């Protein structure tokens, strides 16, 4: 049972050392591992091949700041003085031979961000338009707001950060780090 | 130089079923397999296998034995992937790849295709001016809206004024059965509503474009 065992999500401010691990599973600690880099819509990007002694070898147009390093069956990717350009999911990667069948297997990725500001709402009433239709649909917008995690409060959807959000009632409240 | 080119998004129903291309270019197309990974939205990348390019077998990954099926036309330097009986869960993007062994790492990847599989049928939006509540009195802005409400697939494209706001613009992303999401603008109550604010929504999908004017309520 092959498996790369990832730490799956991590921000991290502006110029601090970032350390991601990758953790083979114990029957393949001695495993040879890749590293890539997704941006949102986009293929994943080589970043470097590391080795269990912790010799790695970095792919084109990958900055110093990057390198990597292992302890038994850890893999670390450290990214010192992080750098806006720098967030991306990191994905580790491990591919193995087993009765002459190459089998392949990536972790679920980390997803890095690089790190205060309250939340704005704009609420709006449903339109005539829609009310002739016997519907109505409250709608709160949430903006300029950091960092992402958001609760809102009021028949209801809303939805993910991307900061600013949106909610729909079919008062607006919002819960930002109080 | 070296490049994958796989073909564009597509939207089936359950049951259906689909083939996507990958056209590699700029090396020797049968000394490299050709490998394929998915991706289901928000989800981690799984291996589906690989072809190899000279004798045309394809070797599938364990979750992907039965409905898959990797094929090529070497001349055409093409690989394909087919899925059969498609379900929901064939929601994904998938990547071919190319893989480099003497240093191991994939090192080449196509742009990735993006395909929806849904019992939905293609719907355009009802487009919904967003007047504010209260007039501004003293405030020096206002802001507006559009609801963008019911439709599918993704995407729509809103624009303010035919492109001619831009900035004050913010088109919020879209939630769930069909799509609903809202755009807003911020422009000077010395602006609006002495000047004309439009609202262009397109959803191409159902080939609709509609304009709203946004009037006081």
């Known amino acids: 049972q092959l498996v790369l065992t990832q730490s799956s999500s991590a921000s991290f401010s502006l110029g601090a050392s970032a350390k991601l691990t990758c953790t083979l599973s114990r029957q393949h600690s001695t495993y040879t591992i890749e590293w890539y880099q997704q941006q949102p819509l986009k293929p994943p990007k080589f970043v470097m091949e590391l080795k269990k002694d912790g010799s790695h070898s970095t792919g084109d147009g990958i900055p110093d700041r990057f390198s990597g390093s292992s302890s038994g069956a850890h893999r670390y990717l450290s990214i010192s003085n992080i750098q806006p350009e720098d967030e991306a999911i990191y994905i580790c990667?491990?591919?193995?031979?087993?009765?002459?069948?190459?089998?392949?297997?990536f972790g679920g990725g980390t997803k890095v961000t690089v790190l205060k500001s309250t939340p704005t709402l704009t609420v709006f009433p449903p339109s005539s338009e829609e009310l002739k239709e016997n519907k109505a649909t409250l709608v709160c917008l949430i903006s300029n707001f950091s960092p992402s995690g958001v609760t809102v409060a009021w028949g209801v959807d809303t939805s993910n950060p991307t900061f600013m959000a949106s909610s729909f009632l079919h008062t607006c409240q919002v819960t930002h780090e109080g | 130089s070296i490049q994958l080119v796989q073909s564009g998004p597509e939207l089936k129903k359950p049951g259906e079923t689909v083939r996507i291309s990958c056209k590699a270019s700029?090396?020797?197309?049968?000394?490299?397999?050709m490998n394929w990974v998915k991706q289901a939205p928000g989800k981690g990348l799984k291996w589906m296998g690989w072809i190899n390019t000279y004798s045309g077998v394809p070797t599938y990954a364990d979750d992907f034995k039965g409905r898959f099926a990797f094929s090529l036309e070497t001349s055409a330097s093409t690989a394909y992937l087919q899925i059969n009986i498609l379900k929901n869960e064939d929601t994904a993007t998938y990547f071919c790849?190319?893989?480099?062994?003497?240093?191991?790492?994939?090192?080449?990847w196509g742009q990735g295709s993006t395909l929806t599989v849904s019992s939905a049928k293609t719907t355009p939006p009802s487009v919904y001016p967003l007047a504010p509540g209260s007039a501004a009195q003293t405030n020096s802005m206002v802001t507006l809206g559009c609801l963008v409400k019911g439709y599918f697939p993704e995407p729509v494209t809103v624009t303010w004024n035919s492109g001619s706001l831009s900035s004050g613009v913010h088109t919020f992303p879209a939630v769930l059965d069909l799509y609903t999401l809202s755009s807003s603008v911020t422009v000077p109550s010395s602006t609006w509503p002495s000047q004309t604010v439009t609202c262009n929504v397109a959803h191409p999908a159902s080939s609709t474009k509609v304009d709203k004017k946004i009037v006081p309520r």
């Open positions: 990667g491990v591919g193995d031979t087993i009765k002459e069948q190459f089998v392949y297997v």
């Open positions: 700029g090396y020797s197309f049968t000394t490299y397999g």
């Open positions: 790849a190319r893989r480099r062994s003497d240093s191991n790492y994939f090192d080449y």
